[PDB]
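Quick illustration for those who missed Monday's session on complexes.
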Amino acid sequence: MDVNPTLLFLKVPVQNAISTTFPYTGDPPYSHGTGTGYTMDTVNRTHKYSEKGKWTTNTETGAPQLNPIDGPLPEDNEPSGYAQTDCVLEAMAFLEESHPGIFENSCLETMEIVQQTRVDKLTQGRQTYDWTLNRNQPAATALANTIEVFRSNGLTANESGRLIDFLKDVMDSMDKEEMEITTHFQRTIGKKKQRLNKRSYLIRALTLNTMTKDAERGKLKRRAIATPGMQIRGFVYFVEALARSICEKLEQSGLPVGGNEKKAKLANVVRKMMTNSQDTELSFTITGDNTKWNENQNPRMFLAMITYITRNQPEWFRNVLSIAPIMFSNKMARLGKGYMFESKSMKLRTQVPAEMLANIDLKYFNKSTREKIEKIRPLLIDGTASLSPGMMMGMFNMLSTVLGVSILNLGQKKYTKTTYWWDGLQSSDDFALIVNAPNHEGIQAGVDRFYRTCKLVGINMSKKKSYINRTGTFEFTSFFYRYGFVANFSMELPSFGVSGINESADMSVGVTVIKNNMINNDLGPATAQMALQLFIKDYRYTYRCHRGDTQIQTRRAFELKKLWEQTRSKAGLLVSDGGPNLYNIRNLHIPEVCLKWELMDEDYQGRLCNPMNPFVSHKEIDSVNNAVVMPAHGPAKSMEYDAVATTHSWIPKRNRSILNTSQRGILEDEQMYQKCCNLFEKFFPSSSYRRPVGISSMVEAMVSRARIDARIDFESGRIKKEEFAEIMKICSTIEELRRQK
Amino acid sequence: GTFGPVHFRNQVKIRRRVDINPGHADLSAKEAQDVIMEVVFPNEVGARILTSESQLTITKEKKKELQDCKIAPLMVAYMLERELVRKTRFLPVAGGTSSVYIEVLHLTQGTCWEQMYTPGGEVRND
Amino acid sequence: GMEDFVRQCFNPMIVELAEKAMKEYGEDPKIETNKFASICTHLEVCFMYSDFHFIDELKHRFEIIEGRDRTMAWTVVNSICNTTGVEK
RNA sequence: CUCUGCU
RNA sequence: AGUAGUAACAAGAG
Ligand SMILES: *O[C@H]1[C@@H](OC)[C@H](n2cnc3c(=O)[nH]c(N)nc32)O[C@@H]1COP(=O)(O)OP(=O)(O)OP(=O)(O)OC[C@H]1O[C@@H]([n+]2cn(C)c3c(=O)[nH]c(N)nc32)[C@H](O)[C@@H]1O
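Prediction with G1G bound:
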């Protein structure tokens, strides 16, 4: 009697039990050590798929560049980056013809976005490469460093607050003959200044930082991802904005819509294909990813698509949209941390930075790394490898799906000019293509035509992990369609458990996750009760907030027991204070504070909901009652939760490991910046709720506001003559401090 | 709310946009923002002036209610944005799409069952 | 040559307020210097109007709403109207 | 002897 | 030793 869970599929169809095929209960495979090997492998692989292209040497950066555009046509089914300019232009032209005015309307919408977009938009996003520090920094921090460097270099055209002005400053910076930056060296703190030549700054402005994608499920081997610099992101935002505007106007483009919007759009489109197909016509659906999609999406083709899309538009708009593909076509990839060398005989470790691989001897490496270094050495320049071809983890997902949907629209009977035709859905590298043809031979001919056309445009379908079946069931971006999308709960299992925001936000998020899974992922009511019980147990263990009546011993047990004895109405206690769990299927949508409000003791209610408690801290409105959640698959998600701000809405300790590094000064600067901003809010309460405006320094605004507030308070009598006198004298002293400096 | 019997039926849930926060229908998002600025940050309003009578009345009642409220103005502003500004969401539903029914959607509509539930309180005439 | 005359025949801080305001509004002050002179004289007259006049039983009797950035000016107006009840 | 446990 | 797997930990920086 050998039990075999897989045999369950003999009765339950695979899709209906697809959740069993997801091991997401276990830990995801993480990456150990450096990502330099993965970056080198990616660069070599990208240059291998385009080897038959043209080799040139950039005249500005001096690095070799490879152009596969209009290269020899593919002669084999392997991935190939030889995209044809004529074919891509033809695909875009036919997309325009089939969807008249799409490019024009999208261009105008992008025009208004470009007009009304501010520099602060670049603050969104995470782990942005900071060229000034040669490391990844938070997007806001990298933006601030770049702005400060530009100001110190005379690029004082960004104070207008418009992103386009910042882009103008970016170009002016690249055109400068020299640059000055500020770096800290400790040997004692030294605020040294470094001078960068034109070529070095150019190389470090096109540089693309690389790391290893961690916690990635479904892949045995780890892969390297990349994040761009501050200069690139500005133009990338506009490019993406235009591509997303175009995508929203395409029925086959489901990328911009997400979640249940994505599922509904895909369901409607597949239903339309099943409907408009002739009854007598044989219908098939292909499921597949595109092999080496990111490695083959050349940026020159993106430049061609942008130039075609921006036809007849104002020349400045064409420039703003086309700059990003230009820069990416001349991009560079940082290698990363480097490698680690060990000596067993002498029993010692060492880390060799990736910048010194262009000269280190090859005897220190194993065979695989030996050949990767040998192959990538020609492209190494100033610690970075030239990666002109391909798109290393490109952010042009929107543009790439525009190209895919253009090729997908090429399958209309007015374009195929044959009995067979095709349509489907495209999203980044994933696609689900439906072929209708009178007979199986027609289906095969249509499949071959689509595959060959994709090869022409540079899209390489992955024959390895793609398959065709009769229309009705398919898969698309981890969404399994079986005559209708089926719920796959295993995807949302990692979201369960303690989120780790705070006691209140984590209770609210847990109950909201259970409720959302009931609504969307077919979480039954009994299983919902199970999930609630398990989440409460995990929450109590994590937060050491077991019920006071329990004998469990923990460093927080004494206080909870004292509170339990103190309270008269036990039911009113929150779970974070040893109170019982009153949640159920009925009230998963009610915050615990409001759920237990009537049961709370008056004094306990006041203490818990005291607005003057020091635990609660409020940042800008954009970071209130919301959290960032990372699903098993997909990008970061902004989850909003309903929670009453109580003493439990505290902040966890901040990682202090930067205190014993040469770059502590940034932390100090952050502290001071906060010290200033919080005072500005003390003078302008609405600064947090909505961003303030003005050109004057903070000191001028604060002192003027203080003076006027003093006069109004005096007139209303809220302050006496002496208080007004002291306020005025302090303001005059502040003025004198500003003047003297 | 009133709970009726639970009926086990072949529920067919269709994904469609519903409202999770009905908002103050008479006041568009911009009017709600102006009212919030009036109530929470009267001095930082700027040049804006309330014209719609609904704005004046709600601003009045809220100011009277919020008298001597020590709660952080930012939290009050966020809660007012939630209360006033309409917010919609695409959700698989099977019964009424009103907010009073969407918030209890997990409780009411299931994969194989429907819980006949009538939320308490007044219901919008629209 | 008139802009130099305006610079040399005005209080430095008055001309500073004029130029900062104009720069806020996005006008090149080197070409349309007539508006520059007009703004400077208007600010100057407002200051004289609010000069040496104090309310006491010393405090400035007149608060110069002009010459300060738009948000600050409207903040002053709103604060005054909220405390005294004068119509905005 | 001090600092750090995502920098 | 062992974890682990294409590169690391088996403390690191002063
Ligand atoms: O939400 C639906 C509808 O309720 C489901 C809602 N709605 C209708 N009436 C009210 C109401 O009184 N109060 C509220 N709060 N909501 C109401 O609005 C939506 C109605 O639109 P929908 O159901 O999507 O389609 P339809 O009902 O056909 O609306 P519409 O196409 O705009 O037409 C409305 C009436 O016009 C009649 N009609 C149009 N034409 C051009 C003619 C005509 O030439 N001759 C005649 N005799 N009638 C015409 C339509 O038939 C329909 O009666």
